[PDB]
Paper text:
The La3+ complex of apo-B-α-LA was crystallized as per the details given in the experimental section and the structure of the complex was established by single crystal X-ray diffraction at a resolution of 1.85 Å with one molecule in the asymmetric unit in P3121 space group. In the present structure, the La3+ is bound to the protein through the side chain carboxylate groups of Asp82, Asp87 and Asp88, and the main chain amide carbonyl groups of Lys79 and Asp84 in addition to three water molecules (W1, W2 and W3). In the structure of La3+-B-α-LA, the La3+ shows eight coordination with dodecahedral geometry while it is pentagonal bipyramidal w.r.t. Ca2+ in case of the Ca2+-B-α-LA structure. The analysis revealed that La3+ is coordinated in the metal binding cleft of B-α-LA with an additional water molecule as compared to that in the Ca2+ bound structure. The average La3+···O distance observed in the present structure (~2.5 Å) is longer than that observed for the average Ca2+···O distance (2.37 Å) by ~0.18 Å, supporting that the metal ion binding core expands in case of La3+ bound structure. Additionally, some unique conformational changes are observed for the amino acid side chains involved upon binding to La3+. The Asp82 and Asp87 side chains are in a similar plane for both the apo-B-α-LA and Ca2+-B-α-LA structures, while in La3+-B-α-LA, the side chain of Asp82 is rotated and hence the carboxylate group is almost perpendicular to what was observed in case of apo- and Ca2+ structures. The disulphide bond between Cys6-Cys120 in La3+-B-α-LA is flipped into an opposite orientation as compared to apo-B-α-LA and Ca2+-B-α-LA. A flexible loop (residues 105–110) below the cleft region adopts a helical conformation in La3+-B-α-LA complex. The average B factors suggest that the structure of the polypeptide in the La3+-B-α-LA complex is more rigid as compared to the other two structures.
In our study, we obtained bovine α-lactalbumin complexed with lanthanum ion (La3+-B-α-LA) and determined its high resolution crystal structure. The natural calcium binding site of bovine α-lactalbumin is replaced by lanthanum. The structure of the complex La3+-B-α-LA is composed of four α-helices and three antiparallel β-strands. The structure can be divided into α and β sub-domains and the presence of a cleft region clearly demarcates the existence of these two sub-domains.
Residue numbers in the entry: 1 to 120
Write the structure that this text describes.
Amino acid sequence: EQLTKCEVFRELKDLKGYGGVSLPEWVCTTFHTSGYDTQAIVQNNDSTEYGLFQINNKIWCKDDQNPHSSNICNISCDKFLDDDLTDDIMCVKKILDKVGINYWLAHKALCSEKLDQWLC
Ligand SMILES: [La+3]
């Protein structure tokens, strides 16, 4: 499920300001993270990351690969592969509360400058 820049901008409104992250930062960060693909999956050895925000199955969500996940967002990872970003955003806030925006490696490098390019 491929979102446009403006759909992402609108669908992430409830993350505006959280941990000091601006909406243009969130649009920029999800672009570099998932290419606005809500069905995005990436694996690194025994780790899998799910959805627009690429939330991992070691700490944040449970799945069949890692049923012993810390599951801190108390959710099945497959809930991050649907079109509705409500529970994705609830989990992102818990990640921000516990680890911060640096969870998203793309953020510090690619999403500090010309943030005005990420407005709808
Ligand atoms: La969802």
